[PDB]
Each structure stands twice: as structure tokens, then as C-alpha cells.
Amino acid sequence: HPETLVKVKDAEDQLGARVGYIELDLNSGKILESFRPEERFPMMSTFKVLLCGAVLSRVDAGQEQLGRRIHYSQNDLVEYSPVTEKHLTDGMTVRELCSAAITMSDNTAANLLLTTIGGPKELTAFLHNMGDHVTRLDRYYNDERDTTTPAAMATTLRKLLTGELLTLASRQQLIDWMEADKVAGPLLRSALPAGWFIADKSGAGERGSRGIIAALGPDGKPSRIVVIYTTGSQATMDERNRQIAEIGASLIKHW
Incomplete structure (x- = not known):
């Protein structure tokens, strides 16, 4: 809804930074x-x-x-x-180790898992072969490395969760682990009314990097994907969280 776009711009202004936003119908x-x-x-x-x-x-x-x-x-x-x-x-x-990497954002867990698949290059190879030629991982725990675009990410995430790539058990496992996320309390979750479904994963990098990717929707059931990234800001962690939250309040209000 345009008001949500307003909040994303407001956020750019208030952070003095770039903010990328995608809202995606999970079904279509x-x-x-x-x-x-x-x-x-x-x-x-x-x-x-x-x-x-x-x-x-x-x-x-x-x-x-x-x-x-x-x-x-x-x-x-x-x-x-x-x-x-x-x-x-x-x-x-x-x-x-997945549980740790998704629910608690465990860094050593991510590394071990990267070793199991043959490293960043093989993850990029995997994303390449599922139609995302944009996203690239380059490292373990304006640089293009370890970047995505909000569209690439939102679509790749939708393929993973509801597309033809994974078995049903594996799509349910992935969504489950995201649903159990324990380290994104102040972001979209803070805007969520009682009984909504949300399954997400947050991120936070220096220079002002903050972000989240999520599948969510009313009455216990996900119906959209939302992706929010921001980098460049000198703002505190807390003021970034607030801005993702406000963006989140808006998209809930205008659902």
C-alpha cells in the first residue's frame, strides 16, 4: 500500500540511508x-x-x-x-545446526553447514541453479560480495518455501525453523497482532546494515513475503529496529 512506501521513504530520510523493500504475494x-x-x-x-x-x-x-x-x-x-x-x-x-543458524543466528553453525555443502561457492551455485543469478555468498564467518537484492531474495525465498524445489517435509522444516526465530523480537514481530503467523530471519551488519526476510499473514497462516534491508546509516541498532517495526506496522495496518 502506498502509505507503506511512505514509511520506507520516511525511514530512508530519518536514517540517512538506503532502504530496500519487497512485499510479495506468497500464493501468486x-x-x-x-x-x-x-x-x-x-x-x-x-x-x-x-x-x-x-x-x-x-x-x-x-x-x-x-x-x-x-x-x-x-x-x-x-x-x-x-x-x-x-x-x-x-x-x-x-x-x-540449522536450528542454531536460523533460530539463534549461530555463526559457527553457519560455517559448519557451509562446509557440509562445499562452501559459499556451492551455495551460490545452488542459488544460481534455482534461477537466482543475483544473490551471491562469498565468505564464511559498495562491495557486491555477500549481497542480494530485495527482489532476488523475496523470490528465492518464495521458491524455497512454496515452490517446486523442496519436498513438502523440507519446506515445512525450513518454515518451522524460521517460525522459531528467537533473535528478531523487536522487528516485524513487534508489529504483529495476536494470532498472526510469522516465520523470519533477521540480519545486522556494520555501517548500519539491518534486515529481515519473512513469511507472514493473518490467523495462523502465511500469505505474503516481506523483505527489508537497509545499509549506510550511522544510526543505533535500536533506531534501525524501530524503523523496520514501523514499516511493519504500516503493512499490517494496510493489509
């Missing part, structure tokens, strides 16, 4: 509104959902199993490893 796949849909923004942690799609894909093909156990060491742990740092002796299963 068609764009309800957009703003800078073809500009590149850092994915930050939002890439972890695409990483687990890749993962689930291998599991559908039987090149991976969700119950397979990975052991690792202190060596492997990078900054912000809330779940992984607790399982150095018993290891983690692939599932768990």
Missing part, C-alpha cells in the same frame, strides 16, 4: 509493492535461511541426513556461537 508470487528492488544490500545473517534450503536440498537428494552428527572444536568456534559453543564434546546434528 507477484509483487504487491517494491522499493529499490534491484539494488544490492548486504544479506548479513539472512543468508542462513538460504544455506539451510541448500542443506535440505541435499537431504531431499539423500546426499545429506538431518540426523547426521558433526563434531568440531574450539578451533572452529567464531564470535557469537551461543549454541555451538555448548556442544564441543557431544557434537551437533545437521538439523540442530
